Amino acid sequence: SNAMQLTSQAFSYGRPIPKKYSCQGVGISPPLSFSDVPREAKSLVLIVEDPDVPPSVREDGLWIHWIVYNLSPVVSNLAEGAQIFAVQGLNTAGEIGYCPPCPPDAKHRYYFYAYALDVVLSDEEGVTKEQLLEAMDGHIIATAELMGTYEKD
């Protein structure tokens, strides 16, 4: 296509994420595919977040489930639970890496955002979303979005 894509073999936009990738299954990271990445991209960034987190546990209403940056722009697929040859940032629990959906109160939406950058960012551990967004500023050449839902059954 004419624009960068972020998709998953496991679910289409707005459909349920399989149980395997939630706290009700093994809780591993879902498969994701990047395609049509601009040739000028030098790295990719992934941010996964839940704007449906109960506000009584998170006042700003947004829980970050995964941060990955400095991915290769030709990475193509991340297989489920795969090794990440890139830098992982901090989720909202304050730990590195992927946190599975585990919505206590309702069905939630989980948004997966991809960003293509025309630079490689500094190699830093412990990166939060706020810090990452600052580092990206001025370097984002394209974005893509995927969303899936989860509701405990």
Instruction: Return residues touching Cl ion (CB under 5 A).
Output: 8-9, 31, 33, 101-103
Among 32, 116, 121, 127, binds a second copy (CB under 8 A): 116
Positions touching Ca ion (CB under 5 A) are: 123
Q: With b meaning 16 or more CB within 10 Å and e meaning fewer, what string describes 1-17? A: eeebebbbebbeeeeeb
Give residue number: closest CB to Ca ion: 123
Q: Which DSSP letter does residue 11 get?
A: B
CB-wise, 10 or 135, nearer to Cl ion?
10
Least distance to Cl ion, CB of residue 30, Å: 8
Q: Which residues of the shown chain bind a second copy in the complex (CB under 8 A)?
A: 1-5, 7, 11-15, 36, 38-40, 47, 113, 115-116, 129, 133, 136-138, 140-145, 147
